[PDB]
Amino acid sequence: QAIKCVVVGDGAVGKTCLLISYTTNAFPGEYIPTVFDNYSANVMVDGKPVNLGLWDTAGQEDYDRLRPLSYPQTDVFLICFSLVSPASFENVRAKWYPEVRHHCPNTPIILVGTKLDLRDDKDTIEKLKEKKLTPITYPQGLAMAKEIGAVKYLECSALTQRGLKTVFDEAIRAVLC
Amino acid sequence: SRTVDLELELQIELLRETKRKYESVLQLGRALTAHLYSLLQTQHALGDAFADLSQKSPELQEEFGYNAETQKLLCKNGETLLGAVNFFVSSINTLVTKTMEDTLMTVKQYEAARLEYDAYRTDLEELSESAQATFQAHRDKYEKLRGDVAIKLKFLEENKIKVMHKQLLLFHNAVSAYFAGNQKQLEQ
Amino acid sequence: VDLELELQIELLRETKRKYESVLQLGRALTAHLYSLLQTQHALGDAFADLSQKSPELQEEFGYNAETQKLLCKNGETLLGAVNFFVSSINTLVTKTMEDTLMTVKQYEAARLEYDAYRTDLEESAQATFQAHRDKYEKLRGDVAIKLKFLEENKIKVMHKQLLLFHNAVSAYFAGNQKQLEQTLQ
Numbered sequence A: 001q002a003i004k005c006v007v008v009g010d011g012a013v014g015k016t017c018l019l020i021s022y023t024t025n026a027f028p029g030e031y032i033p034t035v036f037d038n039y040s041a042n043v044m045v046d047g048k049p050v051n052l053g054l055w056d057t058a059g060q061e062d063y064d065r066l067r068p069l070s071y072p073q074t075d076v077f078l079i080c081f082s083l084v085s086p087a088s089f090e091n092v093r094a095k096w097y098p099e100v101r102h103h104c105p106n107t108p109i110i111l112v113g114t115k116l117d118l119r120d121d122k123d124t125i126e127k128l129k130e131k132k133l134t135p136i137t138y139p140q141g142l143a144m145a146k147e148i149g150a151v152k153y154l155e156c157s158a159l160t161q162r163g164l165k166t167v168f169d170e171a172i173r174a175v176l177c
Numbered sequence B: 001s002r003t004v005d006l007e008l009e010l011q012i013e014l015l016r017e018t019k020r021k022y023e024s025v026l027q028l029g030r031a032l033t034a035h036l037y038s039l040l041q042t043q044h045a046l047g048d049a050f051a052d053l054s055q056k057s058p059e060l061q062e063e064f065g066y067n068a069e070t071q072k073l074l075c076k077n078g079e080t081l082l083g084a085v086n087f088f089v090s091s092i093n094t095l096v097t098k099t100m101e102d103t104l105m106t107v108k109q110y111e112a113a114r115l116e117y118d119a120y121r122t123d124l125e126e127l128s129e130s131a132q133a134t135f136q137a138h139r140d141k142y143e144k145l146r147g148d149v150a151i152k153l154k155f156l157e158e159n160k161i162k163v164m165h166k167q168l169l170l171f172h173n174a175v176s177a178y179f180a181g182n183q184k185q186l187e188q
Numbered sequence C: 001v002d003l004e005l006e007l008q009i010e011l012l013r014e015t016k017r018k019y020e021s022v023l024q025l026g027r028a029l030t031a032h033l034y035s036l037l038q039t040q041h042a043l044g045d046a047f048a049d050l051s052q053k054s055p056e057l058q059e060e061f062g063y064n065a066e067t068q069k070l071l072c073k074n075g076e077t078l079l080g081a082v083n084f085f086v087s088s089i090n091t092l093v094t095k096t097m098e099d100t101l102m103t104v105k106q107y108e109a110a111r112l113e114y115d116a117y118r119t120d121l122e123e124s125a126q127a128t129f130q131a132h133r134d135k136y137e138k139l140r141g142d143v144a145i146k147l148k149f150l151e152e153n154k155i156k157v158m159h160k161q162l163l164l165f166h167n168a169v170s171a172y173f174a175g176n177q178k179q180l181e182q183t184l185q
């Protein structure tokens, strides 16, 4: 089965590494890849073959006009935010959700908290503390998942691949049902 | 031994291949889509970049703006193509995932029925009131679906053409026009 | 002279940035362009295979197959043009532009050390002072030279590259209109 999953969200949240880390199985650390490059993967979810197509996007405003050009025919979305970046989190209901809804009302949305390995990182907790800021909690992510009516709320790390695989098995299941 | 309907069996395996091939054109199609997306963005970016250097590079202002525009243009016309390919990918997906699939459903049943018939029949053979009756049931269900298959198979080869014919025409038209409006402007 | 050099250097650094950008974007263009070619080649066979085994749509499947092949056939040269362009500019950035910076960096240092001792004294010294004044002024003249050379080369290179690039693109689309129209047999 063919399944088109597109990943949206602020730039620097982890979208690109997420896809690369999942498809290759190697954190794209040390080289940072080709720009507007998309991905794909052949997987078996509950005994079924799937051709998962992964569309990466430009978070920036400058792409507000063209990022949506990828929305037609999509089966499920991944709205992402960085667990150690409250800025991206707020933007979920603030920008991404309304956009994905404007264009695709009725499509399975899955909320992803990225950079999980950092939410429990020492210096990250501290550096963040300096700016009188603090990581996003699972309850917070969960509440958001509910506010925007997302079928699932997942957290992961493209670095330690923690939670990674699951993000996509559940993505596929939201389409297969 | 087996209940062979040769003529129909062929039409069946044939539909099965046409199916595979179509799902392959279907891949490429989708993929084509992904690349068009990738170009569009790269072109959009490169457009804004060339534009910027032009604005801040007097000695090369003409050559940079020159490229900026063509890239700014190739980005738009690129959207159009992307739209059309999406329409292509989408329409055939129905033809393959709905219409064609539908028929394959009844083709399944017929084959199940054609099998339980040969099945029961064989038991009676290896063994040798209602026995004849149930033997009749099996046969009537098989012959029934046998008919259904023959009907649906012809209504499909029927729609397959009307769809593909229109879809291929448009697609070619779209990739073509994706040059008519790009030359008449990139060379204007 | 300084401060004015300071400015011309601040500018250099930026120009570097913007070009390193165009380099990236270009690499991208090579990559996606490429992919599009692999896809067209594949779609081209698929349509050819279908057309050969589908007398119902033999034609419409047929011309679509040729078109994809033509596009691919002359998309491969377009890729050669872009590769060259990317390649060229990489040399302008990776070496020429980079060379200049190597001098700029040394020059900045020299100036710092110099301004330093000049102060640490206005409050070995003299013999080392002139030596310093000596290094600094030398480099200061060097920078001026590199900065001049780099600017001139930046133009000789880009004017050709940009133009070549742009012709390749126009060659592409135009090269197609013909063979496309031709197909309209």
Ligand SMILES: Nc1nc2c(ncn2[C@@H]2O[C@H](COP(=O)(O)OP(=O)(O)O)[C@@H](O)[C@H]2O)c(=O)[nH]1
Binding pocket: A010, A011, A012, A013, A014, A015, A016, A017, A018, A059, A114, A115, A116, A117, A118, A156, A157, A158, A159, A160
């Ligand atoms: N620790 C950690 N850092 C990450 C992770 N994912 C991405 N990053 C970093 O986040 C930055 C942006 O990643 P990238 O995928 O290019 O961002 P995006 O493409 O805008 O989504 C990079 O510097 C990455 O190294 C992760 O899961 N764990």
Ligand SMILES: [Mg+2]
Binding pocket: A015, A016, A056, A057
């Ligand atoms: Mg990215």
